[PDB]
């Protein structure tokens, strides 16, 4: 158990992270033609407006929450103590998770049972979406466990682990001592998504079109 503990929480996170980064770079340099969102909307517009919006708006809310929840150092401290952050995560994060899960399930039902989509899908699209649906569900299932420690003691452990990992401080797994198993699973599946990321459609995330908001409308390319 201690062996598996150090593997998944001290070793695996760096394997997943290395693969995520070098895999992204290598696919960007050698696979531009494969770098796309892979829209399937034209083949079947039914239910996509609701499903995709619920899923994306929901998962983006989760991303923002997770990002600032685990990466924001405790000193940045009096106004946002750990237990206040937890309440935010449970309610704001919970709401986003519900939106995400509903959208995700609708998208998965579509991918599996809509003839035109199922017929043109790749195995990776099914795998990656299935894992996201499961991860989101696991996420929501942690809420009743966090509710057992409204003082933020559990979150303090998870945030401690996350910050140790990203700052390359060994012994990260020790921060997780005593945390509920559900959180363990969530963390492992989450890191696994980073591992699979560069070999799936998730690479579209890197391409969020921020620069469009300030770009001149017309583009002309000179002789080159």
């Amino acid at each position: 158990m201690q062996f598996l503990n150090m593997f998944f929480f001290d070793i695996y996170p760096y394997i997943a992270g290395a693969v995520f980064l070098i895999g992204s770079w290598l696919r960007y340099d050698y696979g531009q033609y494969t770098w796309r969102a892979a829209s399937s909307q034209m083949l079947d517009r039914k239910g996509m407006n609701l499903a995709s919006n619920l899923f994306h708006i929901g998962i983006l809310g989760i991303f923002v929450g997770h990002f600032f929840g685990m990466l924001t150092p405790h000193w940045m401290e009096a106004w946002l103590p750990i237990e206040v952050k937890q309440k935010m995560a449970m309610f704001a994060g919970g709401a986003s998770g519900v939106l995400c899960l509903i959208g995700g399930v609708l998208l998965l039902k579509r991918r599996l049972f809509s003839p035109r989509v199922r017929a043109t899908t790749t195995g990776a699209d099914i795998l990656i979406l299935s894992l996201l649906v499961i991860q989101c569900a696991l996420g929501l299932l942690t809420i009743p466990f966090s509710a057992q420690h409204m003082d933020g003691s559990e979150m303090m452990k998870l945030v401690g682990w996350a910050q140790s990992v990203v700052t390359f401080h060994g012994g990260a797994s020790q921060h997780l001592d005593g945390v509920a198993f559900i959180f363990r699973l969530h963390l492992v599946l989450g890191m696994t998504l980073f591992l699979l990321f560069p070999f799936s459609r998730l690479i579209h995330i890197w391409s969020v079109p921020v620069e469009y908001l300030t770009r001149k409308y017309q583009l002309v390319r000179a002789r080159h």
């Binding site: 340099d29 531009q32 017309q218 583009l219 002309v220 390319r221 000179a222």
Partner: peptide, 28 residues
């Protein structure tokens, strides 16, 4: 291609039509 992204600003040529357009000097 990844490193080329860092030449973001260096590849921007003259704008035209009073800011309606931008001429780029990028790979084709």
């Amino acid at each position: 291609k990844f490193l080329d992204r860092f030449r973001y600003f260096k590849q921007k040529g003259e704008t035209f039509a009073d800011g309606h357009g931008q001429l780029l000097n990028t790979n084709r």
